[PDB]
Amino acid sequence: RVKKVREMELIYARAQLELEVSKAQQLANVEAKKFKEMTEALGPGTIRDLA
């Protein structure tokens, strides 16, 4: 009884992990690409002077 529940919750957790990592993945690619465009918009010396 318990082993089937544990096994079923196990595969669900594995796929729920894929949900979590994909959420972290894509939300960071956009976070990094936006930072890519943000710092490219200003300029290498310009951002240094601003900071």
Binding site: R1, V2, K4, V5, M8
Partner: protein, 50 residues
């Protein structure tokens, strides 16, 4: 003394063996209910698993 010994041992063995027989019947009943409840749980949780 012999009469008291046999009477007391009979009176004690009666109240002890009735308890033992009742406990044996309860043990057999309990293991059979354990099988039936095991089937019930193993099918309830299996369907609820789906």
């Amino acid at each position: 003394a012999m009469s008291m010994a046999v009477e007391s041992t009979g009176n004690a063995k009666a109240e002890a063996e009735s308890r033992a027989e009742a406990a044996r019947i309860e043990g057999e009943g309990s293991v059979l209910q354990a099988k039936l409840k095991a089937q019930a749980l193993a099918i309830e949780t299996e369907a609820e698993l789906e």
